Design a protein around this ligand. Structure first.
Ligand SMILES: [Mg+2]
Ligand SMILES: [Mg+2]
Ligand SMILES: [Zn+2]
Lengths: 206, 184, 129, 87, 150, 81
RNA sequence: GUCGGAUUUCCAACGGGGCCUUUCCUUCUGGCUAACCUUGAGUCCUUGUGGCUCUUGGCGAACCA
């Protein structure tokens, strides 16, 4: 139910490997073992980035399918994710929560931060735990960026990457947004690479 | 010697196979010395849905030991002669009926004579010389059993063109279905 | 020790269904487990199951849908007169409409409604719903 | 659920979970529905056609939601070579 | 899971699914029967015999190559011992412990363990006793036993 | 894990299970054809041999038994089966 | 169909019985039916070893002791 187009492109893969999204953490939850490709002699695991890709395409189809492009929420309290997410919001028009996720932002209609998503995307399912926990109280689907040691509780469609290094983060977010826009029609053809650099998504401090 | 090889019943196929038998020992010194003491009881012909048939050969049990030392060449020659027929060698094992609740006097009917043992022997002979590595009954959602036999990888080619034949033969002799499969 | 096989079989199946798994690996197997499962299947409480030979006593792999609220074994296989069935079904099953207290009679193993129909009775194995 | 006149008589036939075939009930605020987008040859997703799944709150709490989604999608044409039937 | 102790270890010979011979084996049945009797005459117990054939003479299973069990092979040729062999070894053990006890009367643990062994002897005994592989009157006593092993 | 195949497990994960806890238990031991050059005769020796096997003729010890496996002597030809 | 119930054909259901599948009650000797023939006879209609009953000896399936 997807064309010979959507398959992983040599260029894409180059990007990924350049940003070491393939570098998985030292321990594997029994829940993410199928993602793990092989383990290196130093104890660092390798992720089937083909699967990283297909999960990206999936998360994209979902982010796409939501009627009002405002409802989708990107989240991150994680430093790097702040920067990346903000842009994600910009190009995709989704709503962003960088930094401190106020508790009860999904319950409690009285507070000013009250939002009623129809999909949450989260950078780190551990540091952003509460947003996941809270999404669970109100039928809100979570799509996360999980390392191989990230709690896969209350998440559907995990994207196996590398929550640690900023390159991996930014890259994944960017690829995500790009795929979404390719799905909407915003970036007409599929041969055309994104005019925008992934480095816009990277975390920079002066 | 077509009446010499059989045991008290001459039919067309049986006389033709006994005659082929003779003409096959007539062209050898060791094969003739081995095949001559080898008698066989009866023969049965049963069809496959490929357009051809199969020749099951009933053998007295205490002779099968010797029959197995020759069976590859013997079936080779008997298949080169009798063409469009898949030749199979089975033993003759008498099954005893299960003791009824009012069964009068019966000696403790041994397990070798049990319906189970016998059918699992028919399986065993059906695929000589390849060796059965494990069986597996499927219980369907329609209430049909399917016995799945698994075979080795040493003599695949000797039997590969015969699988379907078994599925007929067995079905004619046991009433049970069967499927064959080989370990990846 | 392993005193009833049927007991551990049905226990495994139940636990698995609660976890929401999709397959279980029963061991060992029995003519009885086989029959019990065939009856479970006839009413579609489980999908299809496979018996694995190993010369000892086989294992079984059962696939299950999710239609199984609880199956269990009633333990000392009490005898049951025909009129008595009504009381068992009045206790175990959640409803007069459905469910099955499955028996062992001299006319084979079967659910209780088949026992009603064939007009026989025997001992009581367990119960499905 | 019918009566004798052959007419249905429930409040509602409820949503079953897709992974688990168990019922999702009305107070289960951890249950979820997933719309995935049907796509064109041009790689555009149509605004109003979805392949949708249901998931019990149980499966998401237990942390099997993901793997469940994988299998489901893969079998329903969305993915390929993500989810193995063997492990 | 282990009478007379708390431990629950599983450890045993598995067995091949194959009921019949291995391909790579090329000796006759009479060969190994001859070998077996030859070893029994040397004085061995069925166990040690099978171990020898498994080790040196590459016989996987006695009952495979020869359709008979090792014990049946010995009984066929009149080499069956009067008492079955595991029982033999149990009694042997209890004799040993009882002797060490005669010297040491203060080893409580030895007294204890002697009791356990004796119990196993008793249970085993009654089994053999029932299936008539031991004479219905046969009985273990300490003096009797020391007379048996000596 | 919520769904899987048990009748057809991966041979990888299967060869790592304990001897008994597989889909059908079967030994993990094998047999060895061996030769000491000073005899030119193949003996067959069980991989986890418990008795130290001597060659047919010469009083030479092919292998000493240890815990789990058999420790074959230095400078000895062997081959599986 | 019929002058409220009626039974045949079409059809599933659901139970029961007896067989054929290597395979269920086994006989032994004396009495009683019909069936196979030996055998010449009789009544009918297609010119009949066709159908229905006889006269001595048995095969097989029920039957009683
Ligand atoms: Mg134990
Ligand atoms: Mg005790
Ligand atoms: Zn030597």
């Amino acid at each position: 139910s997807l064309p010979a187009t959507f398959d992983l492109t040599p260029e894409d893969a180059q990007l990924l490997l350049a940003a070491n999204t393939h570098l998985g953490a030292r321990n594997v939850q029994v829940h993410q073992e199928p993602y793990v490709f092989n383990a290196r002699p130093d104890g660092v695991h390798v992720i089937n980035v083909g699967k990283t890709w297909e999960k990206l395409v999936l998360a994209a189809r979902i982010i796409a399918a939501i009627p009002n492009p405002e409802d989708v929420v990107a989240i991150s309290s994680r430093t790097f994710g702040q920067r990346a997410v903000l842009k994600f919001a910009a190009h995709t028009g989704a709503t962003p929560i960088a930094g401190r996720f106020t508790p009860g932002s999904f319950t409690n209609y009285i507070t000013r931060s009250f939002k009623e998503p129809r999909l949450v995307i989260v950078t780190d399912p551990r540091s952003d735990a509460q947003a996941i926990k809270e999404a669970s109280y109100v039928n809100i689907p979570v799509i996360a960026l999980t390392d191989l040691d990230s709690p896969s509780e209350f998440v559907d469609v995990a994207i196996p990457c590398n929550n640690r290094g900023k390159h991996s983060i930014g890259l994944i977010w960017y690829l995500l947004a790009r795929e979404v826009l390719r799905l909407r029609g915003a970036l007409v053809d599929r041969t055309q690479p994104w005019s925008i650099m992934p480095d816009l998504y990277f975390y920079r401090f002066p | 010697p077509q009446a010499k090889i059989l045991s008290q019943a001459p039919t067309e196929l049986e006389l033709q196979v006994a005659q082929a038998f003779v003409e096959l020992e007539n062209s050898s010194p060791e094969l003739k010395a081995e095949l001559r003491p080898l008698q066989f009881k009866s023969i049965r012909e049963i069809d496959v849905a490929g357009g051809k048939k199969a020749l099951a050969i009933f053998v007295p049990v205490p002779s099968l030991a010797g029959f197995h030392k020759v069976q590859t060449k013997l079936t080779r020659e008997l298949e080169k002669k009798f063409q469009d027929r898949h030749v199979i060698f089975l033993a003759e094992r008498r099954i005893l009926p299960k003791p009824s609740r009012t069964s009068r006097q019966v000696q403790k009917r041994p397990r070798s004579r049990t319906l189970t043992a016998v059918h699992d022997k028919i399986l065993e002979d059906l695929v000589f010389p390849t060796e059965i590595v494990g069986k597996r009954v499927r219980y369907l959602v329609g209430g049909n059993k399917i016995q799945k036999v698994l075979l080795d990888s040493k003599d695949v080619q000797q039997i590969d063109y015969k699988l379907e034949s078994f599925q007929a033969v067995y079905n004619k002799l046991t009433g049970k279905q069967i499927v064959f499969e080989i370990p990846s | 020790t392993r005193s009833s096989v049927l007991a551990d079989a049905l226990n495994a199946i139940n636990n698995a269904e609660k976890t929401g798994k999709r397959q279980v690996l029963i061991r060992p197997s029995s003519k009885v487990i086989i029959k019990f499962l065939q009856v479970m299947q006839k009413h579609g409480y489980i999908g299809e199951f496979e018996y694995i030979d190993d010369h000892r006593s086989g294992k079984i792999v059962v696939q299950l849908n999710g239609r199984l609220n609880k199956c269990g074994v009633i333990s000392p296989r009490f005898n049951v007169k025909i009129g008595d069935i009504e009381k068992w079904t009045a206790n175990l099953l959640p409803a007069r409409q459905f469910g099955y207290v499955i028996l062992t009679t001299s006319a084979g193993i079967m659910d209780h409604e088949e026992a009603r129909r064939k007009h026989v009775s025997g001992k009581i194995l367990g119960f499905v719903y | 659920m019918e009566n004798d006149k052959g007419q249905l008589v429930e409040l509602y036939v409820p949503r079953k979970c897709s992974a688990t075939n168990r019922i999702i009930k009305a107070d289960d605020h951890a249950s979820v529905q997933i719309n995935v987008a049907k796509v064109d040859e041009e790689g555009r997703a149509i605004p109003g056609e979805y392949v949708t799944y249901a998931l019990s709150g149980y499966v998401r709490s237990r942390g099997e939601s993901d793997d469940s989604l994988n299998r489901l999608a893969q079998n329903d044409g969305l993915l390929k070579n993500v989810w193995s039937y063997s492990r | 899971g282990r009478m007379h102790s708390a431990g629950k270890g599983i450890s045993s010979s598995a067995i091949p699914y194959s009921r019949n011979a291995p391909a790579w084996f090329k000796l006759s049945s009479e060969s190994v029967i001859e070998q077996i009797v030859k070893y029994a005459r040397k004085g061995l117990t069925p166990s040690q015999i099978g171990v020898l054939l498994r080790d040196a003479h590459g016989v996987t299973q006695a009952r495979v190559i020869t359709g008979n069990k090792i014990m049946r092979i010995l009984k066929s040729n009149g080499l069956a011992p009067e008492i079955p062999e595991d029982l033999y070894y149990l009694i042997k053990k209890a004799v040993s412990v009882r002797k060490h006890l005669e010297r040491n009367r203060k080893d409580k643990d030895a007294k204890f363990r002697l009791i356990l062994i004796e119990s196993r002897i008793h249970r085993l005994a009654r089994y053999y006793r029932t299936v008539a592989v031991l004479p219905p009157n046969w009985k273990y006593e300490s003096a009797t036993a020391s007379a048996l092993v000596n | 894990v919520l769904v899987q195949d048990l009748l057809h497990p991966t041979a990888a994960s299967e060869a790592r299970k304990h001897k008994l806890k597989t889909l059908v238990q079967g030994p993990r031991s094998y047999f060895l054809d061996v030769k000491c050059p000073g005899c030119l005769n193949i003996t067959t020796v069980f991989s986890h041999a418990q008795t130290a096997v001597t060659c047919e003729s010469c009083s030479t010890i092919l292998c000493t038994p240890t815990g789990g496996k058999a420790k074959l002597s230095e400078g000895t030809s062997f081959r599986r089966k």
